[PDB]
From TrEMBL, chain A:
Record's keyword terms, sorted: DNA-binding, Metal-binding, Transcription, Transcription regulation, Zinc
Domain of life of the native organism: Bacteria
Keyword check for Zinc: yes
Name this polypeptide is given: Transcriptional regulator, GntR family
Record organism: Agrobacterium fabrum (strain C58 / ATCC 33970)
Length: 232, 235, 238, 237
């Protein structure tokens, strides 16, 4: 319920920092909520990967460094590469293929005549749809939920490195190449080219890594706009 | 908490608590005859393990599995183990971690005799668990170790799942020779910084469990009941 | 040399379709047709067999090799596979400071070909520097055998890295495609520096799909460009 | 034919190391050495340049190509990469019922070369059937260009499937066993049937990568033997 939302907000803002131990009574007091919803909130946020359970009881706010962000992006890329390869090997229905191709055609409409001209917000929304469609493309529920789970951490999400404030020249310029990769993923799946589909979908996740590296080096003010990046 | 986890897992895997059954901490506490505090932890831990799903309106639901789920889970474990192998090959491995896994590989070789059938199956199964735990931790990333171990958390996704004690038969002992050659190649590829090879061999290695599953279905159906949760699957 | 001149002339006659696919060639008849001595012709026939433009027949003579669209696509695929091999081996084995500095310089020069508009691309400069980049990539791991085999896989007129970048292909659609191709050049070098062999191989192999896309664009949208790629106009199943 | 006999004799002399790497060969002096006419010697020297055993010199004539241990390893690497490509393309494009039946028959026949003990292996039977399996794999996708390039990548004596099998057998050089090699043959076919291109490429590449581990063990651990082995004696190191 609302206990999950409030607790999640306090973890993501760094208010409850990594390594902080949390107990049902002391957390219920901190949030000013009953123990029953707090119990559910602590357990749900362990399942989400924001907290770890301690031996002997209680919870601890999970610590994330830059290396964890890079590894989580790498795991999303590996899992998205798996969804793409399995769709290419097993085949995709006419309908599912038509839907993902429609999203790709829609994403092309985000790009103007100059290298800088990109509808950043439209791209970010359509990009989420494309990645959800790719995760479900092979028709396996197990694959879909594992791909979605690898994309569940705030900084591991496909549109995590495209926040509203990152609508700048350098990030927009990068989206052209990223969209060419969306097209190649679909073309490889259609052609039953599993190795290519996996290779492009895995490489595509290096765009978020390259963006993260740009935020660290050239635009540190952007770090705070990425969900989860306030935890680092 | 841990005892509640064990008992609840047993009741799900036996089909006593069938797929689609809604569970609550009060009714589960009553059924297991355990306090609600350990039950609450057991329900949440078994959601993380993938045996239960949380319901939006409260409570939990026992997850249902088909043959396709078993095959996909093994595929995901192999993909993740392939990732651990590639990252250890690209990033490098400490002298100590390398010495430890190599010791496991040397001990695994001692399980094989002169005849194709002469195989210490039980020794192999125990050392195989160690080898796969060492591989998950090899690159030194806690995030990778955690995600590889999670991928191996389903009863049928585990590296040892398709090596139950009763599967100690000719056909299985013969297959272990090639599986051991794959363990050696994984370590050799990592040492040589050959990431593409390390990933390819570790991913292929997981196909051994898929072949074992297919052998159980077609040639030895009596073995199905030896793999946790496999007997419940109807397709 | 007399041998090298016979090679040039004979290659020109094969690529123009003057000596069509399936035509049987012998020393005497080739020497007569080129109006050159038998000694350089013998060398030219053997060198063009090694290049893949002729096949040896059981009997001492040769035959002009016939190519279809499937051959063009497979040749580009083999180049991408071999360039992916050169990239992976450079990433696994390591690259010398000097070789890395040289290929980084080519990548930096290639970036200078791109302007502010998606269309603003120095096409001719890109085509020349692209050849250098691909020669440097073939030699990057330091193996002579690998360099030799990668170069051979890039030896057909339509399998070469700048085959699908003829001077007349300097049009909007091609200039826009070069931006993504250059990002791939950068990623190949970055993956090699990071010892990321799987990534290096994946990007280098994907990079060769740019030529395949250029080919498909020539067939569907710009048929006038087909005749600009050596030997392409001969192919009847485009 | 006179030409073909000159090719065979010259190839034998290069492979044995009798004509070592770096040795310059000229038409008249080579014709005198082999005791053969001018016309067949021209064909032999040109054919062996096309095969990659000789290189042409800038001023005219030929030179026996030098191969060191690093060249052997790189040639096997190129072979594995090309065979991995043949396997992946067969898996992606699909194979006919007939071609699949033929290659599966070869795999079943290869099982017949194994006895109850690890050392109980019919090496000569295995070598012959293995060559067939690799020829069938190269042609499986139906592309003449791919078939041709895979065969070219497998043509150097030390990169050829089934090369030096009795020699490896003598010294226990099957570090990756022949049973493991046969399990890889089965997995290649199974991956192609299943349209699993990434798996087919990975297993076919590993199949050759492990063949190089075996040949490395031999060259390094048996130097006293390789100087008498045709196809290895020519190695310069
Ligand atoms: Na409950
Ligand atoms: Na309800
Ligand atoms: Zn995307
Ligand atoms: Zn294992
Ligand atoms: Zn290029
Ligand atoms: Zn073989």
């Amino acid at each position: 319920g609302r206990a999950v939302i409030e607790l999640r907000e306090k973890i993501l803002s760094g208010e409850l920092p990594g390594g902080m131990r949390l107990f049902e009574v002391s957390t219920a007091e901190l949030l000013d909520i009953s123990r029953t919803p707090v119990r559910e909130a602590l357990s749900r946020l362990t399942e989400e990967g924001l907290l770890n359970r301690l031996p002997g009881g209680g919870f601890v706010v999970r610590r994330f460094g830059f290396a964890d962000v890079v590894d989580a992006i790498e795991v999303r890329g590996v899992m998205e590469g798996t969804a793409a390869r399995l769709a290419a090997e097993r085949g995709v229905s006419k309908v599912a293929l038509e839907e993902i191709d429609a999203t790709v055609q829609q994403l092309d409409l985000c790009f103007g005549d100059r290298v800088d001209d990109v509808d950043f917000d439209g791209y970010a929304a359509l990009n989420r749809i494309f990645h959800h469609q790719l995760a479900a493309l092979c028709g396996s529920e197990m694959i879909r939920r594992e791909v979605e789970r690898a994309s569940s951490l705030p900084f591991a999400s496909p549109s995590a490195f495209l926040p509203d404030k990152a609508n700048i020249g350098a990030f927009r310029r990068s989206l052209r190449g990223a969209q060419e990769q969306h097209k190649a993923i679909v073309a490889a799946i259609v052609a039953r080219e599993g190795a290519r589909a996996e290779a492009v979908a895995r490489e595509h996740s290096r765009t978020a890594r390259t963006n993260l590296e740009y935020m660290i080096r050239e635009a540190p003010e952007l770090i705070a706009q990425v969900p989860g990046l306030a935890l680092i």
